[PDB]
Amino acid sequence: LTCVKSNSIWFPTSEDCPDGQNLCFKRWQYISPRMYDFTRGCAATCPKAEYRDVINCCGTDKCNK
């Protein structure tokens, strides 16, 4: 599986997922009313979304743009 990857170290790019990580995720973490951290990458499992920790996942190549 290949996913879009973007985080504190990576400008948007693509990652070939480590074996056993078969999900691509998009995640938003609340910092303040007008600020959040947006990240993208590979994952093994998808936790439930919450208001301040919003996540969605998918299992097709680069489906997490």
Curated annotation (Swiss-Prot):
- Residue ranges of the region described as Finger loop 2: 23-42
Quote the subcellular location field of this record. Secreted
The record lists the effect of E15G as: In Tx24; change in selectivity from CHRM1 to CHRM2
Predominant location: secreted
* Taxonomy, superkingdom: Eukaryota
- What tissues contain this protein? Expressed by the venom gland.
Q: What Gene Ontology molecular-function terms does this entry list?
A: receptor antagonist activity; toxin activity
Task of the protein: Binds specifically and irreversibly to an allosteric site of the muscarinic acetylcholine M1 receptor (CHRM1) at subnanomolar concentrations and shows a very slow dissociation rate. It also inhibits agonist-mediated guanosine 5'-O-(3'-thiotriphosphate) (GTP-g-S) binding and downstream signaling, and decreases the dissociation rate of orthosteric antagonists (N-methylscopolamine (NMS) or pirenzepine). Is a potent negative allosteric modulator (NAM) for CHRM1 activation and a positive allosteric modulator (PAM) for antagonist binding.
UniProt similarity note: Belongs to the three-finger toxin family. Short-chain subfamily. Aminergic toxin sub-subfamily.
Q: Indicate what this protein is called per its UniProt record.
A: Muscarinic toxin 7
> Native species of this protein?
Dendroaspis angusticeps
